[PDB]
Amino acid sequence: APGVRQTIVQLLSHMRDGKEIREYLHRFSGIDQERFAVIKVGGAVIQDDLPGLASALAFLQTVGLTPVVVHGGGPQLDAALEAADIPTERVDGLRVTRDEAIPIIRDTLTQANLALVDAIRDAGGRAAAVPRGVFEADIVDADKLGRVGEPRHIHLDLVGSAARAGQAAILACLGETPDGTLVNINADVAVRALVHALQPYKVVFLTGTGGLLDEDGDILSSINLATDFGDLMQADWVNGGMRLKLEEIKRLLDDLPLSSSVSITRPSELARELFTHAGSGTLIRRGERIVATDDKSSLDLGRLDNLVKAAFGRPAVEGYWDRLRVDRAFVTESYRAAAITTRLDGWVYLDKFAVLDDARGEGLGRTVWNRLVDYAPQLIWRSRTNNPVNGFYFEECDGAVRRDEWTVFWRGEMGPVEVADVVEKAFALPPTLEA
Amino acid sequence: APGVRQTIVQLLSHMRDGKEIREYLHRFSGIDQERFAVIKVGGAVIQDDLPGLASALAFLQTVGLTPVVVHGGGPQLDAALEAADIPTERVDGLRVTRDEAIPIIRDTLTQANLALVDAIRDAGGRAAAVPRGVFEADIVDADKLGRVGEPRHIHLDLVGSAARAGQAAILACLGETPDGTLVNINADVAVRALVHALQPYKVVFLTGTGGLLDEDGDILSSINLATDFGDLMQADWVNGGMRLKLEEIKRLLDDLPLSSSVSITRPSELARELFTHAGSGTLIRRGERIVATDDKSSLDLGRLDNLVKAAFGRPAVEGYWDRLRVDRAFVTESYRAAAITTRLDGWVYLDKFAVLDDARGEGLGRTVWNRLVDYAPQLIWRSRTNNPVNGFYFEECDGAVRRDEWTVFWRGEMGPVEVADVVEKAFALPPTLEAP
Ligand SMILES: CC(C)(COP(=O)(O)OP(=O)(O)OC[C@H]1O[C@@H](n2cnc3c(N)ncnc32)[C@H](O)[C@@H]1OP(=O)(O)O)[C@@H](O)C(=O)NCCC(=O)NCCS
Ligand SMILES: N[C@@H](CCC(=O)O)C(=O)O
């Protein structure tokens, strides 16, 4: 109680991710009991890597947060104890469970549950076993699915306790009925119900794969449901399986504020993912729409003049804006990330790419970038040999010429000797921000 | 002890620099508690920045790491030494300090000691006051230099005590003859004797400037005495002071094991310095030497084939090694890092750069590489897209062209036409290594 809370202040204040951590914590003080963070976790995780999952969640709690873990039984019961005590598995719609199957489920869930609760503590944490008592559900089928039910009220009583106790709540997917009868609850429906009730600021999905994947099989860093979602469903390259993950994640995020955001990762990266503007693994949000224009008189110059001053660290120089010509402006509804292109001897030129810290974190920088380079297949830009955005530029560039102070990039398909003459012109261009 | 450990690690394991801090712990878990560091503090730094000082020294103490911090009063001591008076004389090259200076010196350092010890604790740490009882010296010269001495034997019992208890041992520079006589001790001669006695993994020199400087006047991230010490000592931009500093830093490091490393940095930087590849100071190793040669014959190509199978995921194609026509090669004395340069339509072109993780971190990747780009001012290379070292490449290139699979870099002033030419060539060169 004494030594912990304190000896991480005067600890992670000498660490490198340290200031950036203290700051989510503080601002993530939309405490309200357990409004902290709901976390679904695959059954094939509690199995194939417990000590990690358990170290992961222990860190959260000893750092400040109060996770509300929910868990399934996949491998451990979809296999083992049913192909074993020989009741077999009956899949109608998707998964029924006659009377004989119940004591197997009850048995196994309270096992993994406890497995996890104890593991966390083993790993430095404080946790609380909540195997039954939260999910009150009706049995909707009877003659069909046998003994499966739907969450008709959430009981936070027991969760509430753990929260004030400094413990993580570890909840299994069993629910009584209004008459006290046991029944199974697939975790998809059960995370909806819980996440509505609590209204959390964060929603993690801990999977073995620990991510969600772009067109090129790489990890999909960030999704803007507002802009990116449409194309995403109606997209040949996104499988049916993932399409659901989406149809079902929007369903979640639409039930929460815009403060809210879901994160899919694997435990070993979960922390580096909740506390870095980088991240690791897919982060999703309702996000904002982007307005795209070429009519300057259609732009909050003063608001933008703020966006720039804030992003760069210095003020644009006098009457810079009134002069500015403007080929195309892409600005996010909130004005927290913009790109403005002028022209240069007939090349699309990136005059300002300005994005704010928290805007980078919601993955909007990326979102503005995309629409820009979906506009300008040939694009020239410069940057200071300092601006730490250079590395993001270098992976988007196709060309790059370095000098002591400036660095010109291109993203067209022209060649070293074709750009040659326009590359020189960007270097020649004068600073439009001060010292 | 394995109680603290277990958990204080189960935290870092999730911190960006968690891995390197975890390692230091494990290394220095028992019996070597006092073998981790010999932190020397400028008398000037206990003056202005005492709080920040304590807060670093404190942050170490609070993760497992128990320093042996040594100090020497400096300025506050000269000011006080002129108060009473009789302050001057340097007959030799060290000061002369006579009987009258003593009572002041001892009570001046003693106070500085306490000051610091109590400071570390306020900061949150745990420390020990060792104002005297560690430095047993003989007395250099009677008449000439007064009551100055030279350390002969180090009595480490008081520091094992501290270290053993999880406490940073704060040692002040005060001597004591074998006939009991108390005596003045020069900090440098005193730190050398202690680093001997202890054989630390580290020897940190804390200052205000917090780093050594290059010809440019920027900071000198590192040094590789095996290679860099000759060059540095003939250079006309390396003044006296800095020569004399490197000299001493060498005498220490020749006396420690290989793993040892001297850092000179600033209190605010100590963490970054000791737990990031980069740090915020000048870091010095004894290091290993590099050979340069036009003479493929004169190389262990069997080793090299490994160095390159181990760096890259896979090994060179069949016959790559026979075939190869070396322009120049720089291989490190241990074949943990090598640049191999061939020729391409005239230009020097970089056919192999391979640096193992362990070597990349010790700072050899750069040592080979400076040696390369020094030989080949105009250089053309290439790298795959998914290559770890592309960022360092891009920091070092003068321009670069990127295609999906590969990327061609270059250095040196080089006309557009000159460059597009050679570039389309290096894109053409076929895989000298096997595929993924
Ligand atoms: C650009 C250049 C390198 C040549 O290649 P190119 O024919 O123009 O084609 P590009 O290099 O532009 O195409 C490469 C890019 O397309 C992109 N791309 C392709 N598929 C993609 C995908 N699924 N997702 C995202 N980006 C994708 C990339 O962003 C990539 O570069 P990257 O490595 O930074 O990611 C050029 O500077 C050049 O050398 N031109 C001169 C031509 C010549 O023959 N010169 C000789 C004498 S005149
Ligand atoms: N990336 C390596 C060589 C890879 C290859 O050409 O096969 C280098 O340039 O040093």
Residue numbers in the entry:
A (entry chain X): 5 to 439
B (entry chain A): 5 to 440
Article, verbatim:
We have now succeeded in solving the structures of two NAGS/K enzymes, from Maricaulus maris (mmNAGS/K) and X. campestris (xcNAGS/K) that have substantially higher sequence similarity to vertebrate NAGS. In both crystals and solution, ngNAGS is consistently hexameric, while mmNAGS/K and xcNAGS/K, as determined herein, are tetrameric. Each mmNAGS/K subunit has two domains, the AAK domain (residues 1–290) and the NAT domain (residues 292–441) connected by a hinge residue, Gly291.
In the native structure, this CoA molecule was visible, as well as a second molecule in the cleft between subunits A and X. This CoA binding site does not correspond to the CoA binding site in ngNAGS and other GNAT enzymes and is unlikely to be functional, since most of the residues forming the binding site are not conserved and there is no glutamate binding site close by. The sub-optimal pH and high ionic strength of the crystallization conditions may be a factor in CoA binding to a non-functional site rather than the native active site. The RMSD between equivalent subunits is 0.4–0.5 Å for subunits A, B, and X, and 0.8 Å for subunit Y.
